[PDB]
Design a protein around this nucleic acid. Sequence first.
DNA 1: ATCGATGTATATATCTGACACGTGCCTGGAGACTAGGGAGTAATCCCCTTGGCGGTTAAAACGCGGGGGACAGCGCGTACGTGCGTTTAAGCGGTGCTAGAGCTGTCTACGACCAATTGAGCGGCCTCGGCACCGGGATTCTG
DNA 2: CAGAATCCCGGTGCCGAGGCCGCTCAATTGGTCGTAGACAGCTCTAGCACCGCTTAAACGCACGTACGCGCTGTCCCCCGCGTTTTAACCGCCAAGGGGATTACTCCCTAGTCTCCAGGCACGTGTCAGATATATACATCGAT
Lengths: 96, 96, 80, 81, 93, 93
Amino acid sequence: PHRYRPGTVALREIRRYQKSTELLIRKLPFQRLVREIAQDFKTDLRFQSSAVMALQEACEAYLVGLFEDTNLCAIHAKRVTIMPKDIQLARRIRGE
Amino acid sequence: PHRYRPGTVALREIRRYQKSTELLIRKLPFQRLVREIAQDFKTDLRFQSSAVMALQEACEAYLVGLFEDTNLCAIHAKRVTIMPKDIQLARRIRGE
Amino acid sequence: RDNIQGITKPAIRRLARRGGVKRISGLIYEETRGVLKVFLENVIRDAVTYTEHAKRKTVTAMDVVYALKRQGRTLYGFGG
Amino acid sequence: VLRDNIQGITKPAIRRLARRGGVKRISGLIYEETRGVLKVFLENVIRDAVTYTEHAKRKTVTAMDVVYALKRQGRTLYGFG
Amino acid sequence: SRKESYSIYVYKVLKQVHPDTGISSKAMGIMNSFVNDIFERIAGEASRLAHYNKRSTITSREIQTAVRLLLPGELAKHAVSEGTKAVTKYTSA
Amino acid sequence: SRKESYSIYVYKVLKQVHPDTGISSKAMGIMNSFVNDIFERIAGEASRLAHYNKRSTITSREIQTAVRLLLPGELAKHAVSEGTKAVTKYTSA
DNA sequence: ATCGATGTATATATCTGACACGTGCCTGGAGACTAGGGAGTAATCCCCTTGGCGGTTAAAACGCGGGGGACAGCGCGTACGTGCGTTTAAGCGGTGCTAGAGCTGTCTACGACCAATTGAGCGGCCTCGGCACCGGGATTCTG
DNA sequence: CAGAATCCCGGTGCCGAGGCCGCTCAATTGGTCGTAGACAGCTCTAGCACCGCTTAAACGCACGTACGCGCTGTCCCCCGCGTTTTAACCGCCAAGGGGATTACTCCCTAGTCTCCAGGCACGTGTCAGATATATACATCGAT
């Protein structure tokens, strides 16, 4: 059967997800995680349907931006694979 | 004659200048530069004696911080010589 | 609890793909989970503080908008 | 008018600043990049300082105008009142 | 209760720039938030500028200076002309 | 005419913590600017909290929440503890 | 297996003006009374958020063929640092003037506040077509 | 040069955008008058200019070896493909905890005249810190 060489599909996916607009995190797992973390500060809290969506949009934007910055640091070392030290360097330089 | 090996004087200067607190740029050449640039916006400007000092302190602290940041991204490439691309990369990641 | 495991590997891959990353090392996942957890913790602490000041029991979208606004990032589309 | 004074930021001063930052070895091209960066930095601060000066209808630039200009960018400087 | 918004004004402007084009509800909510954002930034800077001069009244000079300080060069260059023309026509009426 | 600064109160505290040390005018300038900075940050945050809830007055509840938001966890706990202690002594005076 | 040429630190006595303090004085915090509207209370309405039953699938988890990337070695030449003599002009100390920051002093143009008025705005119901989802087809580009 | 994957022509049908109607309370015109800041006049701070003596710093230089960069080498951490099996998806129905609004009322702050003392400048002096000379000994270097 026909088989694509390594990386052809990665580029196709890159184009697909750069052209799309939908959310990428599963709604239920995120909602359960939010309800779990909030329990340490105050018990029996309640959340409106739009608050979880606002938190999801902010978190997704933050991670996308951090990955964009990490990609520059990876190319600078003449590597292609991103590694934890690259994230650590980007975060240190950003002053987080 | 007598002659030290490469780098020992550099290290001695590093240990010296991190202990001291004086200014490193000449006061008068800098005052001329400040009166040079300000004239492009308005003529006959005057500067209080302390304003030039405030600008010099801000500029020196800024260059020192930029070089400190540049050094981290320089070591990451397994090099010891800093080069222009390190400054350009640091400024790009800082978002300015 | 195990709820942190709900952010499966494919979701992280999709996020990395949107950022243009072509090849990803297998250790990036635990670091990404650690980075996300502290961000969520930071935002929720502020949101819950605003909720508690109002004597409410339900957390509204305005409290999240103000938390993000204080951290220095502004969100458009949910209110305010 | 001064046709050119930015040449007055000498190579030794730049080396000393890199030394305070812990830089051990410096490439020969760093000097012109550093001059360009410093000039770009100074223009942005001076434009605001002059803007406050003109708004106040004064003719003398004052330390406080620089303090407020620096504050707007988030670089509050302590020591000059 | 009744909630105020600029939605009708945003629609009138859109109909003047593109009579055949329409706008969805999400875009109306975004524009309605963006307007309040810029409003708070300009009013904030005008407030700081008033105290440093010991003045008790905000005037058009404070707005003009705040606009020149916040917006980049070309945008400020056009906006200042728009405001000057508007105030001149209003006073002439 | 007569200016106003915190140099006296800073000196009283200095002589209470370390009765044998003095302070240069250069250090006094930094201590004077530090107080104006934190004062402005807290009053700003308290005003925003009061406006969002549609309240006309600023009370200790606003100050306590602002303190819990601006200061880190360890500084906030002690500051709030002694703030409430002081308020209790004042109200009981 | 080592030792001596260099540089740092530290120990002591002298000078001189920065900071602590004492005298002076004036403007702004405390005492005391008053008015009212802002805040704090319970009751009520009512809507929406918390949970389960059902079921059928979009998506995650499991193996592995095998690749092109990350990592190291030796090799080597030229960019940069170190050591020196010449000479520039900043630094410092002093003299003269005045642009212009700053302040007191005069008064009227501008605004806040009350009241009656009314139409531009928001609340809800209606409707119909750009959009959306589907199928079957033509065309692309990688290999 | 085969063909998996892609882009999109064309049909049905829907529910959201546009549009209308209802009716209220935010915005308008008019009058009153108390005072913030626009303005003139006057003062004297410190900023601008000018000169000569000194030598720390700067330039321009010689030069040699440490670092930046390059190929040859490799071995395995992952990309892409398929099967299992799942728990996430929609969809329909529960129901009372909590938010939103109303009317009551009391205690809290703002606002005012009175008045007297805390802390804002001026003056003074003395000893803390800046300075010059000598040397213990560590470190770096070639053999």
